[PDB]
Design a protein around this ligand. Sequence first.
Ligand SMILES: NC(=O)CC[C@H](N)C(=O)O
Ligand SMILES: NC(=O)CC[C@H](N)C(=O)O
Ligand SMILES: NC(=O)CC[C@H](N)C(=O)O
Ligand SMILES: NC(=O)CC[C@H](N)C(=O)O
Lengths: 310, 310, 310, 310
Amino acid sequence: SMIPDFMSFTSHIDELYESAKKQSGGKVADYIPQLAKFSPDLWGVSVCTVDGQRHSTGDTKVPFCLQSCVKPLKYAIAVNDLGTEYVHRYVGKEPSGLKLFLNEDDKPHNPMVNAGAIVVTSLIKQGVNNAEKFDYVMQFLNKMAGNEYVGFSNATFQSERESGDRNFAIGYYLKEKKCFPEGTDMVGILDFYFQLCSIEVTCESASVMAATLANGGFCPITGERVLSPEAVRNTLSLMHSCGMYDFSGQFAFHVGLPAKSGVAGGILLVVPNVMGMMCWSPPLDKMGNSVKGIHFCHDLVSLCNFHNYD
Amino acid sequence: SMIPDFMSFTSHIDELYESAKKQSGGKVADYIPQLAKFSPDLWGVSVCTVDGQRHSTGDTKVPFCLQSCVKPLKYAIAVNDLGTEYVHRYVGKEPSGLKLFLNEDDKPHNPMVNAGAIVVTSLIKQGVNNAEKFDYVMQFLNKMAGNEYVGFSNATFQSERESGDRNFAIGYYLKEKKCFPEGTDMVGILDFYFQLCSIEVTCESASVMAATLANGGFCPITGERVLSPEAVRNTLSLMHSCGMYDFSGQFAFHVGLPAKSGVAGGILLVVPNVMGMMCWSPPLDKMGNSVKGIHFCHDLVSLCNFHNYD
Amino acid sequence: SMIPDFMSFTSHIDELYESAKKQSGGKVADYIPQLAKFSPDLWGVSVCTVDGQRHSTGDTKVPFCLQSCVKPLKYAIAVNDLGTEYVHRYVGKEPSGLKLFLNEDDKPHNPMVNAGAIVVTSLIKQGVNNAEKFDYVMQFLNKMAGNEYVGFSNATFQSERESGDRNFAIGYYLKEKKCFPEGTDMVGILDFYFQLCSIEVTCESASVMAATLANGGFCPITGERVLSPEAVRNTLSLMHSCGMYDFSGQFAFHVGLPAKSGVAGGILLVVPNVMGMMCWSPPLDKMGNSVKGIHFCHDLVSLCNFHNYD
Amino acid sequence: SMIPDFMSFTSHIDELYESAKKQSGGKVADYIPQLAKFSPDLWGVSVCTVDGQRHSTGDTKVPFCLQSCVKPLKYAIAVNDLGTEYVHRYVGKEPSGLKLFLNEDDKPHNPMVNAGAIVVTSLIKQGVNNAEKFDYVMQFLNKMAGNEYVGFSNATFQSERESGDRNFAIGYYLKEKKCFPEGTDMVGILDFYFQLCSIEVTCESASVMAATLANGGFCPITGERVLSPEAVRNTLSLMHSCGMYDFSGQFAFHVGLPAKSGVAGGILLVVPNVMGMMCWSPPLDKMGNSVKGIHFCHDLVSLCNFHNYD
Ligand SMILES: NC(=O)CC[C@H](N)C(=O)O
Ligand SMILES: NC(=O)CC[C@H](N)C(=O)O
Ligand SMILES: NC(=O)CC[C@H](N)C(=O)O
Ligand SMILES: NC(=O)CC[C@H](N)C(=O)O
């Protein structure tokens, strides 16, 4: 709908891509070597419509870690297998202000912040071991990606775990406040958490995952039903209000599209009933969002009138 | 679009209306006599589609004060006459946490909280006197309402002003933090603010105002352009995230529609490109939102799949 | 006690005075002209022992406004005429963190912050008019000063009132939270508050007031009982923990003496059962405390072992 | 000084002891079995003057864990071996408001809160192993106690460590914020921390430790110099403002004596240049302070005029 000529739309994406390219500011994350390795010049943009029409430009086949971009995905999985009610007995449904803490009900504010993602992680495939849990999610991500590139970075995982003092603090804190389900191995969940953060994708395979969320839960390149409508709706609501760290407020105001950024430089973008996208460029701004990515998103909406309330 | 039979849709509204009616909980605001006067049993619901199709049920012709429901409206007017950039040099674009204060830039968090509404009020028709300012806005509201009922409550105004110690505190505070434009008569602005809060409407005339916002700024019963597209988009974004007091987060999550509640018991609802609505029922919940109104909104979305991300 | 030779003690004060003099940093308050007028070079130090032995050095006879230095004094008066229990039904007994707000009981944190001082001001000589109230306190201050210099600055008063937007905000806020006694004219109390802030003294007359607090409530140069033992004890406790704005914590730690600073550059110091002091020097530091004054206080304690726990 | 007849003073202590006894309210800590074991009726009070005069009443020989009562003690040790400047490059010097966090300089607010105690613990006898560290402190406590009862509770230690999720969260958090000295084994420090909390004493041996702090750092029953004057002064200042959890403000106001309470029900009290005391009674109030202990302290000051500013 509302394209209506993909061919010409593609020309405008390449133009926006070229415009963003000139934006060289930002700093590449360096709290671990696996992130510092990256070149500030890498810049890719992949699109995947609700039909299955594709289009890439730039470094769209270089693997990078999802990092926080995986948060909305595992949240979607949890809702899908447990439903809205159960999942939210453990995590909130809205944004907070700026810090490590819980809301008035002693629950993480939402699934998009670390504390929430950690709790969400303790809800998935409970009972089985980490290997089975990890495998189960990889299964899911493959279906969301229509079987395209979905790898894993052991180096990232090892570095994330060995330097995640803050996530461990959050871990013990949540355990103290009784935020996990009965009989949870907190340290085991953090391990699972670090692993999920280390899953690798490319702009191309990620854009398909986004397209699945944009297509009411159906993978546009296989037609298969991956996530329940409830799961997709919840995920998009939270991506709309809590997906860009502290820039979420302004992003929702000026762009108005469900999105989720990651420290690796990615930005999982969704245009409901239209397309899925993945912008990637290592240099991040003060807010922690890909500089070229944010610039691109602004241009995209101020060109194709995609804003939620346009 | 997506109705497609108004006749049958109307039958479902009356059913939802009847269901909400059974909800008798809540307390009628009583900080001033003009609000305490109201009967907890008053309950009206008016709809006005993007075409101009109407439908009411219940006490839809009993005048009541807009109160906070006027906030998105005057914000729309300001953006319309001054543009996004200017207006936001004075007020934020996002929700806050729970208190009287400003954000990191010493500006009210958004136009939907008192401090913000007060600042927005100081931007409209600057220079002229209060009588001209008030008249100017009444002009605007008449156009938004397609000339339907738009009155004024002097009793409310007098009570609001004589008992608004908190708004006066906010007033002096904003003056101290230099939040108003050069040469602003703060006390005069609060007066204007109290007056705007006292403007009266009925569910029927209000639903038309909502319909105008739902119709990209065009009044659906006169076809006239009232607000600029920019103004409408900004207003809806802020209504989506900051329109239900502290219930905004959950409302956005479970209902996902731009809305604004008032202490008088009203709820200005908007379904983009579809219809405008006004629910009214004096009994409010702990959050300050009309009990019958909130119940109705939940049912409406969980029936007609109107949620922003359905 | 523990002097034991005033003559030699005096020599060390002059030496400390000379050392502080070299400290030229700081900025003179300038939010109103009456404060900006002052020369950064003014520097006086007056002592008044528990006996009545005096000693001055520097600009000890130039009148300056008490400003916040009057807070502990009016608090003392209130306790004296109403007792600990009554006064504290309206104001707290301890320091807070960094902002305009009340504690868990909706009361100002303590008498040393503006909100608290304003509430304390509404408790004194209730019923009578401002002229009688003002006169009553002047009476008290004369007795505390042993009839030495106690004037008034109308220019300061007029400027304080015409530019005190923040105090007015606090005023309306306290009125809203019902922090004043039944039937209080809030605006009248702020007026009284501004007047009290405008009372003038000299280092010499102020040091006698301090000496009275140091002498269990007896003016050391007239022997008269001015304040009740209860009043003096409460005042000193609060001066020890809340008398130096945000520097109170560190002052209590490194100096350990009851004290109260003012924006005029004064520092009302008290050495229990030994002496009273008044340091004055317009240039203030980031914390709002007289630079030469703070330097002097540190030296005084690190020389005569006057620290509360030495 | 100011007794002047110990014999008669003792009679008044026994009377205060008897009065407190009637206070049966409170709840015995039960987060671990070692604390829940205790009888709510246990109640002892031991005094040890600056001379060496002793006096006990009640259950003064039943061993109990210092718990937080050890905080001022290890702080004293650190200052003693490292001096004020070094120790405070890691921890603050003042009270905070109500939560897990650091001050504007990313340091624990003070040595009396957990985060601070943990950091202080990482400063003592750096380099050596835990066994040597633990032994070193036991040495110190023996000297402070004049060789009286100083034991250890392995059961408490084991329970403290196996259930201290919050302290572990604080641990990882401090490590993340770089609050420990270079090359610190955080987990090893928490272990040391739990051990220190498990050291046992009796009211009698503890009162001697308090007496040492009251005697400028000299153990009143051996005459030996245990702590440096600097160490003692710093410790008392912090005990005066941060020793009673959230009741510190009011304690400082109404009692005005350096003190430190513990979850075991103890209250290490100090009357500078007069005596040391240890009150013990398992039942704690909402604030976490021994009910009989707080009652006793109030009576003691309102009888013997011991308040800092009496
Ligand atoms: N994308 C992110 O911000 C995640 C960063 C890091 N892996 C964490 O979990 O804290
Ligand atoms: N609807 C509202 O909550 C407004 C209440 C009141 N008139 C105010 O401005 O504070
Ligand atoms: N000494 C002071 O800080 C007082 C300043 C000013 N008169 C006020 O009351 O706010
Ligand atoms: N006395 C106390 O409050 C200490 C309790 C516990 N051992 C802790 O360190 O948290």
